[PDB]
């Protein structure tokens, strides 16, 4: 049974999620205003003023540095949860999403360009952490039959706060010259609401049965969650993997690559972030406004919605399809569509037909590739190995989003409109790859799909 407990725990956590895609697509729209304020604000200091090289570096510096705290929390993650908790941790990071809103929230009236830049960094240390801690919550707390269902609503979360981030860039909601600080800033307001509910929602009844051996605390919190007595089942399962984390050695980063039972798992890991990563969803929205302007921001918020309704369709089907199934026919659906893009995009210079290849490419990317890498990390490992393989995973998706964010416009460029062919070439590879490697895991608890890993070694 789902229980309001349940959804309560899970949508509180789910803010970290939001937060991730928020501070994710808030840079975009006031980059003009901002770039003006570093301008005024070294020209203004007394000395040379700045070049159009250096401007165009700090506007650079403060877009990168997200993504580099964000790799650098995401692969820390191993570094809180087993020493504080999954719910605990949650909490404790929110004075990082503090500091970091108050940085860029006031780098304005600060005259600060050096406050943006470490806001932004603190920012990313942030939604790194998250990107890590919502996932293992989520993947340890949901019943086993939904653990998909309920691990959807982290990219659930991600999607909204990426289009609530379009929608306050917007200059008459927060996108003006006045008003920039507040919309950097709005990061503080999900975090005071998650802190003061964080503290009402449960500690992962795995990580009390397993990592802080109290047996009654976690048989009291699945009885309320899960609104029944008939808990006997899952805790003995809880007691099953308490028995083989206690036997094996504590799993470090490095032993996740040097143990063959957890090579298997963490290349599976690994390859579905770059599959989310690689997919050309980077180049489907960098080529989007082009297209629109052809036949536009207003039309970028509509493929937000699009984004968000196949979200809430993926969720209503992976625990009828699975895992294995969605993703594929998201890869799939998505290669059609990237090579209708190459297409249209040397025929248009048919521009409706263009739009309509980005609209249901967004349609496939969020039935598999979309939700699944986020949640998937958590059902292929059990507790002892979980928080270093989702560091490693989380660094992967993180680092990937990075260097395809740097080496994009140069492929671009030179390439064109044929670059939606090495994706085409990406996303069959993916496609090839969870057909032959991804097992199902759908419905599954991680004893059994650890015993199948070990078995296979
Ligand atoms: C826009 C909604 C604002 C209200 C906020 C809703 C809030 C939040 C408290 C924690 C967050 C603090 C910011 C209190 O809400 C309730 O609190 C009662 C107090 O007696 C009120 O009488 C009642 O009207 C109110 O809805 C709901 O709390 C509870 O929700 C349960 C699931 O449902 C949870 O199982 C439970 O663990 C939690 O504790
Ligand atoms: C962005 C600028 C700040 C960087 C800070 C990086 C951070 C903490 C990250 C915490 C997350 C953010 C709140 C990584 O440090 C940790 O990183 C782990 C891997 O993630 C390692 O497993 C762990 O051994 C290491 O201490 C601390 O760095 C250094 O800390 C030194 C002792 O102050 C250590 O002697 C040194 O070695 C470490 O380099
Ligand atoms: C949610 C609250 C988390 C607070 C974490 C504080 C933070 C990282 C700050 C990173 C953010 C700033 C960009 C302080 O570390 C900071 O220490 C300063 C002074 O030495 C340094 O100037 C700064 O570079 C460094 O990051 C912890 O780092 C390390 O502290 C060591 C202490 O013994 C730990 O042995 C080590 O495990 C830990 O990893
Ligand atoms: C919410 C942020 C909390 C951290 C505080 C940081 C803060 C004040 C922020 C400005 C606040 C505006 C309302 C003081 O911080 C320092 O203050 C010194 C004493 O003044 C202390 O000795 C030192 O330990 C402390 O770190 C210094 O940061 C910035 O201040 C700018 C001043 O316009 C500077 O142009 C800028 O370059 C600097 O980067
Ligand atoms: C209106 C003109 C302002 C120029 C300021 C340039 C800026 C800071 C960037 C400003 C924005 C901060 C958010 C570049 O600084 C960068 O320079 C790079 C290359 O050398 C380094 O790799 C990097 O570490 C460094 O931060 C500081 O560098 C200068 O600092 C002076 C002492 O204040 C030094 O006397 C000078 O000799 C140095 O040149
Ligand atoms: C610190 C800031 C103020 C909020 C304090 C929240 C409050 C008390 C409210 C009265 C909610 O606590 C209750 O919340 C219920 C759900 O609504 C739970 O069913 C119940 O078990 C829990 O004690 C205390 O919660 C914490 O209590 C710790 C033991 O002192 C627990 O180790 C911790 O994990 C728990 O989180
Ligand atoms: C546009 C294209 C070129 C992007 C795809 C790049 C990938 C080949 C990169 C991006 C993320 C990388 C991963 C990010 C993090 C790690 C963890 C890393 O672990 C350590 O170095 C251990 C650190 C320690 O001592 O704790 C090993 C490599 C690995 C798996 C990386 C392998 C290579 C990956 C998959």
Sequence with gaps: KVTPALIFAITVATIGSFQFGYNTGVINAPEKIIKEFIQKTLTDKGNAPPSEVLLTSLWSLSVAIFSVGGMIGSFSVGLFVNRFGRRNSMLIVNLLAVTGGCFMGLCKVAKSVEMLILGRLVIGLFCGLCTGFVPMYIGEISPTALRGAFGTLNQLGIVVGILVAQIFGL??????????????????LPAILQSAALPFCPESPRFLLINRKEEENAKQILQRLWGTQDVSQDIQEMKDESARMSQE????????????????????????????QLSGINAVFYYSTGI????????????????????????????????RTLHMIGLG???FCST?????????????????????????????????????????????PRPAAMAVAGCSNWTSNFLVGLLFPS?????????????????????????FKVPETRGRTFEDITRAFEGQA
């Design 249 to 276: 050695k504590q799993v470090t980063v490095l032993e996740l690559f040097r143990v063959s039972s957890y090579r298997q798992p963490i290349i599976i890991s690994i390859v579905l972030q770059l599959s989310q």
């Design 292 to 323: 629109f302007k052809d036949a536009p921001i207003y039309a970028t918020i509509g493929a937000g919605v699009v984004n968000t309704i196949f979200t809430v369709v993926s969720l209503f089907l992976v625990e009828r399809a699975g895992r």
């Design 171 to 188: 200059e008459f909601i927060l996108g003006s010259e006045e008003l920039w600080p507040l919309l950097l800033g709005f990061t503080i």
């Design 340 to 384: 209708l893009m190459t297409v249209s995009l040397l025929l248009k210079d048919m521009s409706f037909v263009c739009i309509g290849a980005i609209l249901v490419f967004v349609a496939f990317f969020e039935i598999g590739p979309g939700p699944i890498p986020w949640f998937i990390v958590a059902e292929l490992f059990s507790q002892g």
């Design 333 to 335: 659906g998505m290669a």
């Design 411 to 435: 492929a671009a460029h030179y390439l064109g409109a044929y670059v939606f062919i090495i994706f085409t070439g990406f996303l069959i590879t993916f496609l090839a790859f969870t057909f």
